[PDB]
Design a protein around this ligand. Structure first.
Ligand SMILES: Nc1ncnc2c1ncn2[C@@H]1O[C@H](COP(=O)(O)OP(=O)(O)OP(O)(O)=S)[C@@H](O)[C@H]1O
Ligand SMILES: Nc1ncnc2c1ncn2[C@@H]1O[C@H](COP(=O)(O)OP(=O)(O)OP(O)(O)=S)[C@@H](O)[C@H]1O
Ligand SMILES: [Mg+2]
Ligand SMILES: [Mg+2]
Lengths: 332, 325
């Protein structure tokens, strides 16, 4: 398993140190509104090298430091440490176990380390630059954001595919071949994944400009069971979400990543679709490590470990391992 | 005034006429993904006079005509009729029952009727002008759009308050009344904590923006943006109910606005919804049992036949498949 551990101290609602051990397969995170779950996903984005405070729902980076509660004073530093297993050599860093630590102080000062040795933010970025982590709409799906590829411009989608393809002269010719090759693989998987998730129907991808692989956009076409193909726009909230999930899974088949974070991607899905999704997720989890925030029983039942996050104390997150038989209040 | 009936004929997935009777109180519409529920809210927007096909998920207005399915051939006309109780003379017509019809043909013709007499789109728009009906973030909330006011820039928030007010001098009066409610509604919804609305520039009111302050119980005030998905959703819902308190409407359509809410917050939302239905009729699309439990009537939308929507009254105890878990 690639993601071994996440240590969080003073980051947002986690005033006290929490240490999260991940398992192979599916790690599910559950809990009531406002407890600190999405904050964990932010901690992951941050330690991987996120440079935009707004991407972390803040205005300035100092907003990610625990700012206090009715029961506590604000802290003046936040620290996140992620521990990774690089036995295969997935990283351009020839250590067995890799750790990355990021800190920020209320002064605005920051510190970065790789395996305990001080480094630059750029070193952390460079370290993960081609790993696949932790890119939105690719390896980390934010809450509310599952439809982001669908809502993108066709031209925007080409760029996603290019990046998944590892993309002048006859090198340009080579770039064309790679893009098309990756595009054909993804397209092929997309049709199949769509069918499995919906229990039928079909989906496909199209080039908007077949004459120009540099400039073409990508159209998405999807036909749920029983329906006539119509504009993607006319599809329902749940149909659009499940189409987005099919496309995501397909991209991850073609361009694997060491772990994927999914923050309530199944919100729009009905009971039948969540079940198909959760079983697919479980199968997929053999290849790729998933960390999911979920409120759905169907997903929780497929989980290899469940962590409940709560805020008994005003403003402060607590994380414990929980059994499903008594998470019954956390079932949507 | 209230909504008595909606007839939907050939509109989107409703190939066959479906006639939906409404009760005052809360009507919940339930069913599986892709079954036709949001399409019902689109029919309402459309018959009230919506001009933008894009607002209805289409590209051209023709897109709202049943376009065929695996089972059924495409149709060439779509028609929606809404029927309203005008006993009180809410509407400036002397009829006690008012109906409005809109049609579109695949060939491009339109018809508009008020009480069966042909009219223009403008006459329907003018008819409902003072009602406040079919206004996004006000009297209708589309799927996925509950945070529309919260995620608006302070200046854009103002315009919404203007439509709510009636758009000098009128903004401010409306703002202050909504502000006075927002604090209470936010507490009642969360079970505590404090919130407020603030004017950026109180000295210029054709221009100034509105800031929103929201602090859940025991938590400390930071940027609105740092609140959780469920917390922002419940805040937006508090603001919506605050708007409805001051600029009330005869009916309000809510398409899965409680999606981000946990079970406890759904329960508080749903009880609040029931109480609010004293003054306003609610038609809600929902998958949540707390909401279904507070509904006065439940309608289940399904596609037994591929691509074609049908609706029937359903019992809660027969709808366990539909309850989100
Ligand atoms: N710098 C900070 N200091 C203290 N608390 C914070 C800070 N930043 C954010 N929070 C709080 O952390 C709480 C939990 O945030 P999230 O992790 O977004 O909640 P969640 O568990 O994802 O809840 P959902 O999406 O409603 S089920 C929110 O109330 C924030 O207000
Ligand atoms: N003109 C049309 N002809 C036939 N079908 C249409 C037309 N317009 C939309 N639809 C279908 O309506 C379906 C979407 O229905 P909605 O009413 O949005 O679903 P929903 O019941 O809200 O489902 P959710 O949001 O996932 S629980 C799509 O699958 C479309 O194929
Ligand atoms: Mg969240
Ligand atoms: Mg819908």
């Amino acid at each position: 398993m690639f993601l071994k551990r996440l240590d969080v101290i003073g980051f947002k609602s986690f005033a006290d140190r929490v240490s999260i051990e991940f398992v192979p397969g599916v790690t599910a995170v559950v809990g009531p509104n406002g407890s600190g779950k999405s904050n964990i996903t932010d901690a992951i984005r941050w330690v991987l090298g996120e440079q935009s405070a707004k991407s972390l729902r803040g205005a300035k980076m100092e907003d990610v430091i625990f700012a206090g509660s009715e029961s506590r004073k604000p802290l003046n530093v936040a620290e996140v440490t992620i521990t990774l297993d690089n036995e295969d050599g997935f990283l351009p860093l020839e250590y067995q176990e890799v750790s990355v630590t990021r800190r920020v102080y209320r002064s605005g000062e920051s510190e970065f380390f790789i395996n305990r040795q001080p480094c630059r933010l750029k070193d952390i970025v460079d370290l993960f630059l081609d790993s696949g982590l932790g890119k939105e709409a690719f390896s980390i799906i934010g809450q509310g954001r599952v439809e982001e590829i669908l809502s993108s411009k066709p031209e925007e989608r080409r760029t996603i595919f290019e990046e998944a393809a590892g993309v002048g002269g006859g090198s340009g010719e080579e770039m064309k071949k790679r893009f098309l090759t990756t595009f054909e693989q993804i397209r092929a998987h997309f049709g199949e994944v769509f069918g499995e998730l919906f229990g039928g129907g079909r989906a496909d991808l199209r080039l908007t400009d077949p004459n120009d692989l540099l400039e073409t956009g990508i159209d998405i076409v999807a036909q749920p069971p029983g329906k006539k193909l119509q504009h993607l726009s006319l599809l329902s909230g749940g149909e659009r979400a499940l189409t987005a999930i099919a496309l995501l899974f397909s991209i991850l088949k073609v361009r694997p990543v060491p772990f994927c974070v999914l923050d309530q991607v199944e919100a729009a899905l009905d009971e039948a679709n969540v079940q198909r999704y959760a079983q697919y997720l479980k199968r997929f989890s053999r290849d790729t490590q998933f960390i999911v925030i979920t409120h759905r029983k169907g997903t929780m039942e497929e989980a290899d470990v469940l962590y409940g996050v709560t805020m008994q104390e005003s403003g402060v997150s607590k994380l414990v391992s929980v059994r499903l038989e008594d998470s019954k209040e956390l079932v949507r």
